[PDB]
């Protein structure tokens, strides 16, 4: 069961990546936005200390929220929403990705 769904999903995903040269750029950005959050929590687990807690929480929020806006751009960029073009999803990505950096520079 899971072998068939596994190899089916690997092949049907890798063909989709090799078709469009926009998708591997998104996913290459995404994976290293996961590794930033992982080692940034590893600093907390390594030495037991919790003192500048807001400065901990700001970078972690940058990693998670910045991951999510990429996944929304990917979902909206493969299949188009009814009424929204592909020139407007990108501008909304710029504006809403540009508010979040300011409110995570005030917070540290």
């Amino acid at each position: 069961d899971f072998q068939e769904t596994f190899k089916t999903s690997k092949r049907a995903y890798f063909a989709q990546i090799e078709k469009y040269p926009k998708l591997k750029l998104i996913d290459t950005f995404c994976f290293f936005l996961v590794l930033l959050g992982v080692i940034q929590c590893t600093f907390i687990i390594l030495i037991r200390d919790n003192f500048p807690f807001n400065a901990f929480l700001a970078g972690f929020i940058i990693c998670v929220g910045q991951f999510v806006l990429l996944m929304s751009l990917r979902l909206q960029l493969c299949n188009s929403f009814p009424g929204i073009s592909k020139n407007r999803a990108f501008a909304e990505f710029i504006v809403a990705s540009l508010i979040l950096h300011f409110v995570c520079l005030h917070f540290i």
Binding site: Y20, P21, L25, F29, D49, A55, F56, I108
Partner: protein
């Protein structure tokens, strides 16, 4: 104490890691956006 008279985030040397985990996402983001409108589709 006021809200301005506090040791800043430079001077603590416990939160250099997080400032270095903000600057990377900023410059990686601008190199993302410049390298997105100067490329092709299914060339």
């Amino acid at each position: 104490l006021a809200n301005d008279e506090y040791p800043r985030s430079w001077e603590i040397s416990n939160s250099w890691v997080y400032i270095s985990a903000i600057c990377g996402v900023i410059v990686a983001w601008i190199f993302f956006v410049v390298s997105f409108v100067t490329t092709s589709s299914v060339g």
